[PDB]
Symmetry: C2
């Protein structure tokens, strides 16, 4: 529409993360005017390679590789100043120059202070110990800062940039309260405030009014804006497999709340789905395969922590979660990834429905107890038993692979626009 | 679209609340199939009158008056079981029968426990005292529960409905942690858990899968779904005049995150705007009138707390916040209310821009310090000096009133569909 303005493009994980959505973002960031993030998530990282050089992004948008585009961090993101610059400098020393020239931070973003990471790397203990339920609260202090936001007692970039006395004084009252809720919490206010006053000036030239920055972007001449979704649908604070979830909305709604743009300014929303299901840590897993198949999907897929080495749990594709992810996100197109991992299988199983106590339920269970109780209903399809890593067109994929694809499109109701069969860009076949 | 399904209708406050958006909701709830809430907010109340009987709603959707419709509470709402039933029974005794027959609660909604209200009615003190910054943390325990959600250490309806031992045990670990963060916090676990086990069975027949309940609603035959926005744009956790804000997203994005529906399932979004600006409590107020005009707007408008009696601060309409509210919500039409309050004025002033340090800025300041510093740029318009309370058509409004209306439509870019000149339905003139 001429009144609506430009409609942003989004990329979101459709399962439990690690779907490989960075290859879609990377593919799309090429001709994008603005690349951004709207919610923090797990703060997971993404590796992008350009000219032999390898970059590692966590907080910064992956499209910052494109020096002809603008990278934007939304208000819905919690940021750790040292974390940010430590990440920026690191890449700066890898070839990423002039980044400070194309990065803009929304002044409405909340700050993750050092003591937020402290209490975080403190609760996990008292929360677990001996034999609790180690949800695995990523010690990035994401949750602690999200609570300050809730208590309206937290601080944001705009405050750090305003009068420093009021801020410094507000920083003190916040740290005090924290020390009052956690006595075994050491801080050193003056030292941190001093380091923050340093960050204020260092980050000032990049901060701007996020809401106005976006409104103008999509109401001026036609621009192509890309948004990188945090993790995946089932790791969404509200809709994920709670409590084994992130503190952020990792679904399409978070794009509106994380950027300050109305739903009409949202266009294509791609759901990144892996040809099979993976997941990390404790929690229910309906299609999990603790057997030869799982080991295979784990080996051929290299399904393990990139920093820890922890193996990810593997299972058959699951349409129950896939459709659920869709009800919430309203995908316009999908990116089916790692289909090649299955080139070896003789026949592939895919879950199509859930039966609770003998009955077939049409919804995705919200609680762990129920979710762990569902018995999966399967559909066995024949495999293509052929190498697809070389495919570069729909016509290349063998007849059974094409069927595996239509199967996913049909049962989801969303068309597949990308089929992934490798690690390179060429390996991400575009179907239309 | 035939694929999209039905597009929900939303009503949201465009300023600092108290705009009178309940008269729009009430007007629209008449022919609605489903009426709902997606975010808690301040939990403010709304009074609806039917047949001499007067109802008071806080948590329950105001459309529950319509016995031919379905009332739905979304996952994005925090609920206090006793608060809910105390409110439901009260109205039940006022004429509202069979309500339990048309109310559905999303099982993904978080629970506000008694100790959440306790710590809330405990922090306000330690947070303020002598002479702090009494933000006015409404002692409903809304923030405390929103932090538990953040810490992923909180509970929801679905958990209360699942295995009670695991829940009861999880309730205990949560209350413990709280008592560990606040020593002067008394609880009585067994007593509360016992009362909760009572609520579980009492509320079970109304709980359902919220996401699936909505997906089916807008993907089955054409339905008219209405959503009541929590408070107002400037009381939005992310976009409001932080920290003097609510713990919820009170903007359009919260409809997606509070209900689990994609942006395409969102249709008309009405912004309710008062013919002048009001606000309660501490905080910056650009167009505030501490003079004869303010007293007038306060008197003719009955601008005071409905339970406390506290007078609300009054000022001229402010287009700077109005446009800001729009950038965020993307209103399709507005409801201009209380225009009659101005029938008496000889000439009305309305703020059109903000100038910071001599310069005209195009954005709405994010921080208090800056916001308090802006000098308002005004546009003086002539008043109509006539009684408009009897108007029932556009053609009734005098020439200057019509101008006041076009003025708001032009500078906002959104058309006015309702002009309010009274307290009754007939007084809410429809322009198209």
């Amino acid at each position: 529409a001429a009144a609506t303005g430009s409609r942003v493009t989004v990329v979101l994980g459709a399962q439990w993360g690690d779907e490989g959505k960075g290859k879609v973002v990377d593919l799309l960031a090429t001709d994008a005017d603005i690349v951004s993030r709207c919610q923090g998530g797990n703060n997971a990282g993404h590796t992008v390679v350009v000219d032999g050089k390898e970059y590692d992004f966590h907080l910064l948008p992956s499209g910052i590789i494109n020096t002809k585009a603008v990278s934007f961090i939304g208000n819905g993101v919690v940021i750790h100043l040292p974390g940010l610059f430590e990440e920026a400098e690191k890449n700066e020393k890898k070839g990423l120059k002039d980044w400070e020239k194309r990065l803009i931070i929304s002044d409405r973003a909340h700050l993750v202070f050092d003591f937020h990471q402290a209490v975080d790397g403190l609760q996990e203990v008292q929360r677990q110990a001996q034999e609790g339920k180690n949800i695995g609260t990523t010690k990035k202090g994401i949750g602690p800062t999200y609570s300050s936001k809730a208590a309206r007692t937290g601080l944001r970039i705009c405050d750090l940039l305003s009068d420093f006395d009021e801020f410094s004084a507000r920083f003190k009252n916040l740290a005090h309260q924290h020390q009052s809720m956690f006595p075994t919490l050491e801080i050193d206010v003056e030292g941190q405030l001093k380091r923050l006053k340093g960050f204020a000036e260092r980050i000032r030239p990049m901060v701007r009014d996020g809401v106005y920055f976006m409104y103008e972007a999509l109401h001026g001449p036609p621009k192509k804006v890309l948004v990188e979704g945090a993790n995946a649908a089932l790791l969404d604070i509200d809709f994920g497999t709670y409590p084994f979830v992130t503190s952020s909305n990792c679904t399409v709604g978070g794009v509106c709340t994380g950027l300050g743009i109305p739903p009409q300014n949202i266009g294509d929303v791609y759901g990144v789905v892996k040809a099979y299901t993976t997941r990390v840590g404790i929690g229910a897993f309906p299609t999990e395969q603790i057997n030869e198949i799982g080991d295979l999907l784990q080996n051929r897929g290299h399904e393990w922590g990139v920093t820890t080495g922890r193996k990810r749990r593997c299972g058959w594709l699951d349409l129950m979660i896939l459709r659920y992810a869709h009800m919430v996100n309203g995908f316009t197109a999908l990116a089916l990834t790692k289909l090649d991992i299955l080139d070896v299988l003789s026949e592939i199983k895919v879950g199509i429905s859930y039966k609770l106590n003998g009955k077939r339920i049409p919804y995705f269970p919200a609680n762990q107890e129920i979710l762990q109780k569902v018995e999966v209903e399967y559909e066995t399809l024949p495999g293509w038993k052929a190498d697809t890593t070389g495919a570069r067109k729909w016509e290349d994929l063998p007849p059974q692979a094409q069927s595996y694809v239509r199967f996913v499109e049909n049962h989801m109701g969303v068309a597949v626009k990308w089929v992934g069969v490798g690690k390179s860009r060429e390996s991400m076949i575009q179907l239309f």
